[PDB]
Write an enzyme that holds these catalytic residues in place. Structure first.
Site, PDB file in Angstrom:
ATOM      1  N   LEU A 171      27.276  63.900 -47.731  1.00 32.79           N
ATOM      2  CA  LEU A 171      26.037  63.920 -48.509  1.00 32.79           C
ATOM      3  C   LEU A 171      25.446  65.332 -48.572  1.00 32.79           C
ATOM      4  O   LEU A 171      24.567  65.598 -49.399  1.00 32.79           O
ATOM      5  CB  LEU A 171      25.017  62.914 -47.937  1.00 32.79           C
ATOM      6  N   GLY A 172      25.953  66.212 -47.707  1.00 31.17           N
ATOM      7  CA  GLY A 172      25.534  67.603 -47.580  1.00 31.17           C
ATOM      8  C   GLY A 172      25.766  68.147 -46.183  1.00 31.17           C
ATOM      9  O   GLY A 172      26.199  67.407 -45.293  1.00 31.17           O
ATOM     10  N   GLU A 173      25.488  69.448 -45.976  1.00 32.61           N
ATOM     11  CA  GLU A 173      25.685  70.101 -44.677  1.00 32.61           C
ATOM     12  C   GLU A 173      24.454  70.883 -44.219  1.00 32.61           C
ATOM     13  O   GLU A 173      23.904  71.682 -44.972  1.00 32.61           O
ATOM     14  CB  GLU A 173      26.946  70.989 -44.680  1.00 32.61           C
ATOM     15  N   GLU A 174      26.964  68.225 -40.224  1.00 35.21           N
ATOM     16  CA  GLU A 174      27.017  67.609 -41.545  1.00 35.21           C
ATOM     17  C   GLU A 174      26.342  66.233 -41.576  1.00 35.21           C
ATOM     18  O   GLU A 174      26.106  65.637 -40.527  1.00 35.21           O
ATOM     19  CB  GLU A 174      28.464  67.542 -42.079  1.00 35.21           C
ATOM     20  N   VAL A 175      26.020  65.760 -42.779  1.00 37.84           N
ATOM     21  CA  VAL A 175      25.414  64.452 -43.021  1.00 37.84           C
ATOM     22  C   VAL A 175      26.428  63.647 -43.822  1.00 37.84           C
ATOM     23  O   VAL A 175      26.981  64.154 -44.802  1.00 37.84           O
ATOM     24  CB  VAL A 175      24.022  64.547 -43.716  1.00 37.84           C
TER      25      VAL A 175
ATOM     26  N   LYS B 229      23.719  61.933 -39.472  1.00 41.58           N
ATOM     27  CA  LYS B 229      23.893  63.353 -39.184  1.00 41.58           C
ATOM     28  C   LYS B 229      24.826  63.428 -37.968  1.00 41.58           C
ATOM     29  O   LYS B 229      24.575  62.757 -36.961  1.00 41.58           O
ATOM     30  CB  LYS B 229      22.542  64.031 -38.881  1.00 41.58           C
TER      31      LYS B 229
ATOM     32  N   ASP C  35      10.408  73.826 -43.144  1.00 39.56           N
ATOM     33  CA  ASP C  35      11.446  74.236 -44.113  1.00 39.56           C
ATOM     34  C   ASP C  35      11.379  73.388 -45.349  1.00 39.56           C
ATOM     35  O   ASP C  35      12.390  72.888 -45.853  1.00 39.56           O
ATOM     36  CB  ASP C  35      12.837  74.164 -43.449  1.00 39.56           C
TER      37      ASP C  35
HETATM   38  C1  LIG Z   1      22.735  60.601 -52.153  1.00 40.86           C
HETATM   39  N1  LIG Z   1      22.088  61.238 -51.011  1.00 40.86           N
HETATM   40  C2  LIG Z   1      21.597  60.646 -49.911  1.00 40.86           C
HETATM   41  C3  LIG Z   1      21.124  61.641 -49.115  1.00 40.86           C
HETATM   42  N2  LIG Z   1      20.579  61.499 -47.809  1.00 40.86           N
HETATM   43  N3  LIG Z   1      19.970  60.308 -47.495  1.00 40.86           N
HETATM   44  C4  LIG Z   1      19.341  60.512 -46.359  1.00 40.86           C
HETATM   45  C5  LIG Z   1      19.534  61.829 -45.867  1.00 40.86           C
HETATM   46  C6  LIG Z   1      19.096  62.570 -44.773  1.00 40.86           C
HETATM   47  C7  LIG Z   1      19.439  63.909 -44.679  1.00 40.86           C
HETATM   48 CL1  LIG Z   1      18.828  64.796 -43.329  1.00 40.86          CL
HETATM   49  C8  LIG Z   1      20.220  64.559 -45.635  1.00 40.86           C
HETATM   50  C9  LIG Z   1      20.409  66.068 -45.609  1.00 40.86           C
HETATM   51  C10 LIG Z   1      19.164  66.813 -46.114  1.00 40.86           C
HETATM   52  C11 LIG Z   1      19.335  68.328 -45.988  1.00 40.86           C
HETATM   53  N4  LIG Z   1      20.577  68.766 -46.718  1.00 40.86           N
HETATM   54  C12 LIG Z   1      20.755  70.252 -46.515  1.00 40.86           C
HETATM   55  C13 LIG Z   1      21.738  70.919 -47.510  1.00 40.86           C
HETATM   56  O1  LIG Z   1      20.658  71.505 -48.284  1.00 40.86           O
HETATM   57  C14 LIG Z   1      19.702  71.165 -47.247  1.00 40.86           C
HETATM   58  C15 LIG Z   1      21.787  68.067 -46.155  1.00 40.86           C
HETATM   59  C16 LIG Z   1      21.637  66.570 -46.372  1.00 40.86           C
HETATM   60  C17 LIG Z   1      20.710  63.793 -46.707  1.00 40.86           C
HETATM   61  C18 LIG Z   1      20.342  62.455 -46.829  1.00 40.86           C
HETATM   62  C19 LIG Z   1      21.346  62.825 -49.821  1.00 40.86           C
HETATM   63  N5  LIG Z   1      21.944  62.583 -50.979  1.00 40.86           N
END
Ligand SMILES: Cn1cc(-n2ncc3cc(Cl)c([C@H]4CC[N@H+](C5COC5)CC4)cc32)cn1
Length: 258
Positions: A12-16, A31, A117
């Site tokens: 979902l991003g960076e890990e998550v 996470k 942040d």
């Molecule tokens: C579809 N989708 C669901 C999500 N999702 N749902 C809950 C959730 C919780 C967190 Cl902490 C994160 C993080 C938020 C900080 N970022 C960093 C990369 O730039 C800043 C990574 C991911 C993602 C989360 C994101 N997209």
């Protein structure tokens, strides 16, 4: 790629990761972290969180040296992906997100937590486009037992950071989060950040202090939200508008529709 009864399907991003329960099909965010003292603090903060505009914490599991922090899924993704470069988004949508961001920030400040942040990548959206403040890795306590503690650590993301972080040995938490919210509002209305950082060597920041609003990004913003931005992006944190006064602002209370 699994943790107990959950499977880790996609990044979902960076890990998550998106964690889909094999049995129930419930989907949460997890996470994954490989620091021990930092995570203990972050978990204590996460356990305090209970508001509609903040990502909810479900629990944690430890597998060897790996920590798994389970949290509310925000299926709509990030606010960053709703901002069109050089354009922004429709003003009514920006105002609704800004109201929700204020509701989440008021909640955090009310429990004595500062996020530190705030930026579009950390502002997530649920299935009905409700905003959720996410990622508490930099969050800290600024008020405890009704006593405020000034901050001194530098952290955040330079284009969103308040000038007092760069200029003062110690500073109040709340005005720093208010300032980053003003930069988020600028990004939503103009699709462009105003400066790399609000420092003495930054010409774009000097231009704003000199009220050169015929320049980008300001020239893209209507006079009513720009009047609010003139009250938020104030160098001196003691003269800067507080959230109770943002709630009295003309644009904040202006009816808008696409
Ligand atoms: C579809 N989708 C669901 C999500 N999702 N749902 C809950 C959730 C919780 C967190 Cl902490 C994160 C993080 C938020 C900080 N970022 C960093 C990369 O730039 C800043 C990574 C991911 C993602 C989360 C994101 N997209």
């Amino acid at each position: 790629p699994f943790v107990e009864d959950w499977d880790l399907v996609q990044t979902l991003g960076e890990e998550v990761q998106l964690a889909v329960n094999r049995v129930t099909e419930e989907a949460v965010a997890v996470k994954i972290v490989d620091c021990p003292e930092n995570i203990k603090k972050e978990i204590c903060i996460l356990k305090m969180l209970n508001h509609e505009n903040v990502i909810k914490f479900y629990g944690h599991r430890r597998e060897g040296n790996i920590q798994y922090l389970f949290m509310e899924l925000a299926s709509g993704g990030s606010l960053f992906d709703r901002i069109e470069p050089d354009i922004g988004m429709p003003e009514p949508d920006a105002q609704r997100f800004f109201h929700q961001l204020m509701a989440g920030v008021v909640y955090l400040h009310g429990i004595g937590i500062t996020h530190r942040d705030i930026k579009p990548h950390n502002l997530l959206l649920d299935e009905r486009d409700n905003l959720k403040i996410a990622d508490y890795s930099l969050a800290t306590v600024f008020r405890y037992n009704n006593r405020e503690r000034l901050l001194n650590k530098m952290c955040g993301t330079l284009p969103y950071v308040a000038p007092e972080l760069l200029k003062r040995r110690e500073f109040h938490a709340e005005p720093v989060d208010v300032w980053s919210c003003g930069i988020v509002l600028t990004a939503m209305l103009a699709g462009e950040l105003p400066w790399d950082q609000p420092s003495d060597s930054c010409q774009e920041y000097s231009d704003w202090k000199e009220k050169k609003t015929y320049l980008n990004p300001w020239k893209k913003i209507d006079s009513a939200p720009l009047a609010l931005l003139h009250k938020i992006l104030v160098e001196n944190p003691s003269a800067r508008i507080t959230i109770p006064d943002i709630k009295k602002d003309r644009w904040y209370n202006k009816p808008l529709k696409k």
